[PDB]
Amino acid sequence: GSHSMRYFYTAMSRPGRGEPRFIAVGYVDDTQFVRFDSDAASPRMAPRAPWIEQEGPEYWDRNTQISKTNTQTYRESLRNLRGYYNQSEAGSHIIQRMYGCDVGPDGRLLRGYDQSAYDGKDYIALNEDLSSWTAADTAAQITQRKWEAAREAEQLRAYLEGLCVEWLRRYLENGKETLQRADPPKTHVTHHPISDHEATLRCWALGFYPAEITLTWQRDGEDQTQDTELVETRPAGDRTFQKWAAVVVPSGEEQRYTCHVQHEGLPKPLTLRWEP
């Protein structure tokens, strides 16, 4: 239905081990499609999905040029931030940035994002109005004043409402056979005895895309939220994802427990029981 494009920038200093490394990756929803790595032998924006390969030389040149410039600016910014916090030259530090757009099923912009973190902590974020900034501390206020004078917010707003949405529309059309194909999970329930009186029921979902899914156990129609172990959704390596939910039941009470599965690729939501 709805979709998103996000770019993720990480800039990492490594004192005594060369200049800071700059890595950029681009995603459409849960699919990576480009990457740039400043340590590469020949640094350039490079394809990571088939449907982006068809883009012309001016595309890869623009994306590589912007990324090369970013490599130097982020090196400047790490030096600046180290100063804002009176930090020494010995430690390694990390700027992270995420930005992009969400579009609804009509392809209209739902909202844009731009936000930054320093060493894992929120630093500065563009507000939802795409016009003002939230600075996290007095260091970030300096960055905010720099960006107001540079009209950063106006450039990002123009990008987020223009190129971001347009190219996302174009990416969704060119990769429609994968990006707009929802693969349903393969499901089943397993039974692992723990003792004479209890056993583990585990509800499995495999091979689904996109990663968004709902896996829940019920006891007598009642949700077992507190008592369900949920593993983090993990990638299979072939674009699809996996997940499981597990609950420990009194032996002999198994059939009071149901696993419920909602996913966009499912015709109908699923209800599964342990089948001995």
Binding site: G26, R62, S67, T73, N80, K146, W147, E152, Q155, C164
Partner: peptide, 9 residues
Amino acid sequence: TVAASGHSY
């Protein structure tokens, strides 16, 4: 496609 290079922090 990437946004244009932004200003330094």
